[PDB]
């Protein structure tokens, strides 16, 4: 009774935590924009007017003819940008003009968020040890709620990034304490099931985010809505690494497990946080991510049970990488196929997360098990921090970030073939 109720509450918390993580692709979606031109803001056709007021692009994002030319002089967006509000009424990109010259700020915002996750885990470890895990979890709920509300009403971009950093600082503690509490009260034999249940809670959070963002098209309102439930969550909440590396034989397993954690984190947080490239419809992609993760993670658990631990992880990582590579390979015209491939890739990445979480426990003796799992978690968080950054390589071509996202998991899975069991 108590175990199931606690599991349900923590599943709800994880759903909302996934919402916090994945909100960025909605609250930071880049709308179609253009320099604010006077002649565009003898009237003629809007298409013709825009043709004589904005140079053509591969509709140029950030240029405008100095004087309306009827038919070099192109100049930057001196007066600002005009954002298309057909989908989103407001966004951080539209609010702070994170386009073109300052385009790197959005992926940099996502990197700051993930660095906040890393720092929050690092601090909450010793804090959760020093103070009760339940107390730290309650304080993390409170911090998540307040940081989300503040970042919703952030006046300037540095303030928004700072409060996203503190929000991540809090979510790291939330995740740490939720996982620890689930582990403590669950029988050692039932650990794979509990891990799968938590991952399924995250999958449900994907669709929850999709629905909330669909309803609330204002980034301020979206952030505030996703942050409010943590107020209620707070209300009703009431063997060192040196030795691990020293051992000679362990080095192979340690390196490969850490590489797998890093590959999962990098690929997921570099792809999951930018679904605009993956598919045309962000809401549909967000929904399908969870809709496929559910069966994907269930099948991952089934294969893990019957097909084995190592081959299941290898298959999941290879599937993710190959699907991402195909997505960047198949023609951009075939949008449906690319969206399906991206959904399959994210499902495989989630399955790989389940597999590695349930596998790294077995790979190492009980004395070093906690240290190995912690090292894997830290590597995953570092890869997450590096995830959004590689999207900056898209300036040369949008295919390069996806090529990196695909070749990382493929190589990690191939390396996963050397694991013992
Ligand atoms: C930081 C991560 C990647 S975890 C994490 C931290 C913060 N935000 C989300 C996740 C996360 C990402 C994908 C998941 C999936 N699928 C997932 C499932 C359950 C719990 C968290 C996640 C790690 O620990 O290395």
Quote the tokens at residue 390.
């590689």
Long-range contacts of 152-161 (CB under 8 A, 24+ apart): 152/220, 152/221, 152/223, 152/224, 152/227, 153/220, 153/224, 156/96, 157/92, 157/96, 157/98, 157/105, 157/109, 160/92, 160/96, 160/109, 161/108, 161/109, 161/112
| Ligand 1 atom closest to Cα of residue 203 | 16
Distance between CA atoms of residues 177 and 131, nearest Å:
11
Long-range contacts of 362-369 (CB under 8 A, 24+ apart): 362/309, 362/421, 363/253, 363/257, 363/419, 363/420, 363/421, 364/244, 364/250, 364/253, 364/254, 367/239, 368/239, 368/243, 368/244, 368/250
| Ligand 1 atom closest to Cα of residue 379 | 25
Is the separation of the CB atoms in 149 and 224 below 8 Å? yes
SS3 (DSSP) at 35: strand
Is the separation of the CB atoms in 344 and 326 below 8 Å? no
The alpha carbon of residue 77 and the mean position of all alpha carbons in its chain are separated, in whole angstroms, by: 31
The alpha carbon of residue 78 and the mean position of all alpha carbons in its chain are separated, in whole angstroms, by: 34
Is the separation of the CB atoms in 28 and 109 below 8 Å? yes
90: buried, middle or exposed (CB in 10 Å: 19+, 13-18, 0-12)?
middle
Quote the tokens at residue 346.
């994210």
Is the separation of the CB atoms in 373 and 366 below 8 Å? no
- In degrees and rounded to multiples of 5, residue 35 shows phi and psi of -60, 140
Distance between CA atoms of residues 171 and 381, nearest Å:
13
What is the residue extent of each domain of the chain?
A: 1-26+108-209+216-238, 240-421
Residues counted in the chain:
421
* CA nearest ligand 1 atom 24, residue: 377
Beta strands in 184-225 (DSSP E): none
The alpha carbon of residue 214 and the mean position of all alpha carbons in its chain are separated, in whole angstroms, by: 18
From 122, 268, 317, 379, the mutation candidate for ligand 1 (largest count of ligand atoms within 8 A of CB) is 268
Could you tell me if the CB of 16 is within 6 A of ligand 1? no
SS3 (DSSP) at 62: coil
What is the second-level CATH architecture of the domain 240-421?
Answer: Up-down Bundle (1.20)
What was the resolution (in A) of this experimentally determined structure? 3.2
Distance between CA atoms of residues 125 and 170, nearest Å:
12
Q: What sign has the CA pseudo-torsion 25, 31, 32, 35?
A: negative
The CATH number that domain 1-26+108-209+216-238 falls under is: 1.20.1250.20
From 13, 20, 21, the mutation candidate for ligand 1 (largest count of ligand atoms within 8 A of CB) is 21
Distance between CA atoms of residues 53 and 49, nearest Å:
6
**DSSP code at position 38:** S
Quote the tokens at residue 208.
């929850």
Give the Å distances, CA to CA, from 4 to 72, 142, 150, 176, 186.
68, 24, 33, 19, 10
Quote the tokens at residue 88.
């989103």
Could you tell me if the CB of 297 is within 6 A of ligand 1? no
Could you tell me if the CB of 376 is within 6 A of ligand 1? no
Could you tell me if the CB of 353 is within 6 A of ligand 1? yes
Least Cα distance to 293 among 378, 186, 210 occurs for: 210
CA torsion angle 375 189 173 117 (round to 10): 40
Least Cα distance to 394 among 277, 285, 282 occurs for: 277
- In degrees and rounded to multiples of 5, residue 192 shows phi and psi of -55, -40
The answer to whether domain 1-26+108-209+216-238 and domain 240-421 are alike in fold is yes
From 7, 13, 20, 175, the mutation candidate for ligand 1 (largest count of ligand atoms within 8 A of CB) is 175
Ligand 1 centroid–CA 235 distance in Å is 24
Could you tell me if the CB of 377 is within 6 A of ligand 1? yes
Distance between CA atoms of residues 420 and 418, nearest Å:
6
Could you tell me if the CB of 262 is within 6 A of ligand 1? no
| Ligand 1 atom closest to Cα of residue 20 | 8
| Ligand 1 atom closest to Cα of residue 378 | 25
Is the separation of the CB atoms in 79 and 67 below 8 Å? no
SS3 (DSSP) at 273: coil
Distance between CA atoms of residues 166 and 158, nearest Å:
12
DSSP assignment of 83-134: ---SS-SB-HHHHHT-SGGGTTHHHHHHHHHHHHHHHHHHHHHHHHHHS-HH
Distance between CA atoms of residues 86 and 281, nearest Å:
13
* CA nearest ligand 1 atom 1, residue: 381
């Amino acid at each position: 009774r108590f175990q199931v109720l606690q599991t349900m509450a923590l599943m709800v918390s994880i759903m909302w935590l996934c919402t916090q993580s994945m909100l960025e692709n909605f609250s930071a979606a880049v709308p179609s924009h253009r320099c604010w031109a006077p002649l565009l803001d003898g009237s003629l056709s809007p298409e013709a007017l825009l043709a004589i007021s904005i140079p053509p692009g591969p509709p140029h994002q950030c240029r405008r003819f100095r004087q309306p030319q009827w038919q070099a002089d192109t100049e930057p967006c001196v007066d600002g940008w005009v954002y298309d509000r057909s989908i989103f009424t407001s966004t951080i990109v539209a609010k702070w003009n994170l386009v073109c010259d300052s385009h790197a700020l959005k992926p940099m915002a996502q990197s700051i968020y993930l660095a906040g996750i890393l720092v929050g885990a690092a601090v909450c470890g010793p804090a959760s040890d020093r103070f009760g895990r339940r107390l730290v979890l309650t304080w993390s709920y409170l911090q998540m709620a307040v940081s989300g509300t503040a970042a919703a009403f952030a006046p300037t971009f540095p303030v928004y990034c700072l409060f996203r950093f503190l929000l991540a600082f809090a979510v790291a503690g939330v995740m740490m304490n939720t996982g620890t509490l689930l582990m403590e009260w669950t029988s050692a034999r039932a650990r794979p099931l509990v891990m799968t249940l938590n991952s399924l809670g995250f999958s449900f959070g994907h669709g929850l985010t999709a629905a909330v963002a669909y309803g609330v098209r204002d980034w301020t309102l979206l952030q505030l809505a996703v942050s409010v439930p943590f107020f209620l969550c707070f209300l009703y909440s009431w063997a060192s690494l040196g030795t691990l590396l020293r051992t000679p034989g362990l080095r192979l397993r340690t390196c490969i497990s850490t590489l797998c954690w890093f590959a999962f984190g990098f690929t997921f947080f570099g792809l999951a946080l930018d679904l605009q490239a993956l598919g045309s419809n962000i809401f549909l992609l967000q929904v399908l991510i969870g809709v496929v993760d559910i069966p994907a993670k269930m099948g991952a658990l089934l294969l893990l049970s019957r097909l084995g631990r190592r081959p299941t992880l290898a298959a999941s990582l290879l599937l993710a990488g190959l699907c991402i590579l195909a997505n960047t390979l198949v023609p951009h015209e075939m949008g449906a196929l690319r969206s399906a491939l991206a959904v399959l890739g994210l499902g495989g990445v989630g399955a790989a997360f389940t597999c590695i979480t349930i596998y790294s426990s077995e790979l190492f003796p009980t004395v070093l098990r906690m240290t190995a799992v912690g090292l894997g978690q830290m590597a995953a968080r570092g890869g997450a921090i590096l995830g959004p950054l590689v999207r900056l390589l898209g300036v040369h071509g949008p295919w390069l970030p996806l090529l990196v996202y695909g070749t990382v998991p493929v190589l990690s899975g191939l390396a996963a073939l050397l694991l013992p069991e």
